[PDB]
Every structure is written in C-alpha cells, then in structure tokens.
Amino acid sequence: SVVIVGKISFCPKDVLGHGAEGTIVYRGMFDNRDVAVKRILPECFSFADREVQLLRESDEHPNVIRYFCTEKDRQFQYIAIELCAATLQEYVEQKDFAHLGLEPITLLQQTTSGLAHLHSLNIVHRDLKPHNILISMPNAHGKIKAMISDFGLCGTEGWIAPEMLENPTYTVDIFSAGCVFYYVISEGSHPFGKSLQRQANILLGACSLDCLHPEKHEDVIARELIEKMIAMDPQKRPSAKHVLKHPFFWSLEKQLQFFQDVSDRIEKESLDGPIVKQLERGGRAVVKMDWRENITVPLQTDLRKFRTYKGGSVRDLLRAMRNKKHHYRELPAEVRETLGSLPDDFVCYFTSRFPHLLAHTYRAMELCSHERLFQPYYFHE
Numbered sequence: 001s002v003v004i005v006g007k008i009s010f011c012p013k014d015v016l017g018h019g020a021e022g023t024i025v026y027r028g029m030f031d032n033r034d035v036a037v038k039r040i041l042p043e044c045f046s047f048a049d050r051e052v053q054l055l056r057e058s059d060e061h062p063n064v065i066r067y068f069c070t071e072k073d074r075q076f077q078y079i080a081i082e083l084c085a086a087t088l089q090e091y092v093e094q095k096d097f098a099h100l101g102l103e104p105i106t107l108l109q110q111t112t113s114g115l116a117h118l119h120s121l122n123i124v125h126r127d128l129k130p131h132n133i134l135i136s137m138p139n140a141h142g143k144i145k146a147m148i149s150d151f152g153l154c155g156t157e158g159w160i161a162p163e164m165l166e167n168p169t170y171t172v173d174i175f176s177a178g179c180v181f182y183y184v185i186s187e188g189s190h191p192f193g194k195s196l197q198r199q200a201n202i203l204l205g206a207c208s209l210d211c212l213h214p215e216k217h218e219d220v221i222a223r224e225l226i227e228k229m230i231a232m233d234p235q236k237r238p239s240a241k242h243v244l245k246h247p248f249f250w251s252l253e254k255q256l257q258f259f260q261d262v263s264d265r266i267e268k269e270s271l272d273g274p275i276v277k278q279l280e281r282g283g284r285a286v287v288k289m290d291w292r293e294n295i296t297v298p299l300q301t302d303l304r305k306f307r308t309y310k311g312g313s314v315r316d317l318l319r320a321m322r323n324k325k326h327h328y329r330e331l332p333a334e335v336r337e338t339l340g341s342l343p344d345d346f347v348c349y350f351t352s353r354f355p356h357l358l359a360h361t362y363r364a365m366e367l368c369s370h371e372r373l374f375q376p377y378y379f380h381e
C-alpha cells in the first residue's frame with residue numbers, strides 16, 4: 001500500500017515510530033529521497049507550524065534531524081524528515097556501533113550541541129530520551145553522528161523532570177539529558193533505577209550513580225556533571241552551553257593546559273585570598289594529605305631538592321606540574337620516563353594518582369570564570 005499526498009508519499013503499513021501528541025512516522029519518499037514522514041494531527045498543527053518556521057529561519061545544525069518539506073490536506077499535515085539508521089537505545093544495548101567510529105563522549109557532545117541549538121530558538125523538546133536520539137545514516141565516508149528528533153524508532157518511562165507531573169523551560173530537557181548521559185556511560189543503567197521504579201524515585205529524588213567509581217578520575221568528572229543536570233532544583237541545572245564547557249568533554253591536552261593556566265593564574269595570589277583559600281579548601285583529601293608520597297620515586301627524588309613545595313597544598317601540586325611541564329625537555333632521563341609522552345601520559349600520571357584534582361580545581365576556579373584566560377574552560381555571557 002502507498003499514500004500519495006503530494007511531492008511527499010509514504011507507506012501506511014510501515015510505521016517507523018510514534019512520539020509526542022499522537023504523531024506517527026511512516027517510511028516514505030520525497031524528491032526521490034528515502035525519508036521518514038510524520039503525520040501531524042489537528043491538535044498539533046499550531047505546535048508544528050511554529051517549530052517548522054523557527055527551524056526554517058535559522059541555519060541547519062548537523063545534530064538536529066533535517067527537515068525537508070511539508071504537505072497539507074484538510075485533516076492532517078505531512079512532514080518529511082531525515083531517515084535514520086537506529087536509535088541511541090540500540091546503540092547502547094546492541095554494542096554494534098563500537099567499530100563505527102562514533103565514541104560515547106562525542107555522541108553526547110553532539111546530543112548536547114543539538115539540544116543547545118533548539119534552546120537558542122526557544123524550542124523545548126520535553127520528550128528527550130534515548131529513543132528520541134537517532135544515529136544517522138552513514139556518510140559518504142561511513143561517518144555517523146547523533147541527532148535530536150521528536151520521534152523514536154521501533155523502557156520509555158522515567159525521563160521526565162520532577163517539576164512537570166504550560167511553558168516549560170530548557171531546564172526540563174537538561175534533566176532528561178542528565179539521565180541520558182548516565183545511560184550511555186553506564187551502558188544501559190538509569191540514575192533513578194529500573195524502568196518501572198524510575199518515575200516514583202524521581203519525585204522523592206532517589207538516584208544512584210554507583211556505576212561511576214569514586215576514585216577513578218574519568219568517573220569523578222562525569223559524576224560532577226551528571227548530578228548537577230539531574231538536580232531536583234531546576235535552577236541548579238546548567239544550560240546546554242554550560243554542559244558543553246564541562247571537563248567531561250576535554251581532551252587530555254586540554255586538561256593539562258587547564259592546570260597550567262590555573263597555575264600561572266594563582267602564582268601571585270595572596271594565599272589568604274578567596275581564590276587560593278577556595279582552592280585550598282578541598283585541601284588534604286584531594287592531595288591525599290601529602291602529594292609527595294603519592295608520586296613515584298624518580299619524581300620524588302627530583303623535587304626533594306626544591307625548596308618549599310608544601311605537600312598539603314593543591315596550589316603547590318599544580319605548581320610542581322606546571323614546572324615539570326615547562327622544563328620537561330631539560331629534565332633528567334629517569335624523570336621523563338616516569339612522565340613521558342607529554343601531554344597525554346604526563347597528565348594521566350597525576351590524574352590517575354589524584355582523581356579529584358581536576359574536579360576540585362574546576363569548581364574552585366569558577367571565580368575566574370569571567371576572566372578572559374578561562375573562557376575556553378567556562379561559559380560566560
């Protein structure tokens with residue numbers, strides 16, 4: 001069977017997905033392209049028109065599903081949208097995409113970038129979940145990407161923010177995004193528990209991130225971001241543009257450059273001042289109360305001669321890293337062997353032995369978020 005309403009045509013017997021206000025998506029064709037075709041019901045006409053026009057009036061974002069064309073009969077609208085290979089649910093559960101080059105963290109960056117593009121248009125998803133996040137068809141070179149969509153393809157409960165249960169703000173989607181982040185990193189777990197118990201745990205705020213290790217650097221960074229996004233108070237949730245600046249997305253090189261930019265910034269500070277007082281507030285726990293005992297012998301031997309370098313100061317640890325990074329070429333051979341392969345192995349050396357160093361430093365240095373030097377690491381204005 002086939003239905004021809006216009007340049008658009010589709011197959012009623014083939015249903016690709018159902019989201020959001022009685023909308024149903026069928027396989028179809030437009031302009032000799034294979035597309036998915038959404039059927040808009042009269043209740044959704046006003047919502048559709050406003051969003052189509054708003055999307056049409058700005059540039060195309062690679063991480064928002066593409067809009068082709070629309071046709072209208074009396075009883076419905078028909079919108080042709082980009083056809084996709086799979087959902088994020090399949091990507092996480094199936095594991096098939098492991099070798100296709102799209103990594104989990106970069107997938108979340110794309111998902112967040114597309115969500116930020118919608119929020120900049122005053123569009124709120126309100127449905128966001130793994131079923132709604134689609135994996136694109138392969139590129140000419142086989143590259144695939146993640147895309148925001150209102151409909152999923154063929155455990156849907158528990159993705160909704162507590163406050164809704166009407167003009168919601170972006171903060172609703174950030175809560176959903178927070179659950180999606182954990183779902184990808186944990187490979188199928190949800191912060192609020194199993195599918196049937198999620199929505200009740202969301203109202204009383206019972207969440208478990210325990211798939212993230214407390215002493216593992218990578219997991220500590222992710223935990224700090226996720227718990228802010230799924231926070232009960234909507235005002236404590238960061239905007240999508242704030243999320244994109246979190247160290248969760250930084251390359252190893254960018255992490256080491258942050259420590260350097262911080263070290264050069266607090267070099268002249270009063271040490272009674274709020275900056276260093278804030279950074280030293282975490283204190284001994286971050287450095288394990290002596291950071292000279294948590295580093296390997298060749299490094300210990302080299303900086304034992306150096307005066308000062310208080311073992312309980314976070315600033316001094318960052319000062320040592322800054323100095324060994326600067327003199328790296330001129331250091332003794334046995335010292336370069338312990339660090340080596342700069343920046344990657346150099347920064348992993350310290351982050352592996354001090355898993356809270358970057359997270360603690362990032363929260364403490366927010367006081368400089370407005371300053372020009374930290375604009376790569378924070379979002380301001």
Ligand SMILES: Cc1ccc(CNC(=O)N2CCC[C@]3(CCN(Cc4ccc(Cl)c(Cl)c4)C3)C2)cc1
Nearest residue numbers: 020021023047048051052065067124125148149150
């Ligand atoms: C790619 C595209 C998107 C929307 C349209 C036109 N609208 C439309 O199809 N709708 C389907 C039914 C539900 C909604 C009401 C709220 N709306 C939120 C929302 C969620 C997700 C996205 Cl990506 C966007 Cl843009 C907006 C989705 C309207 C045409 C083409």
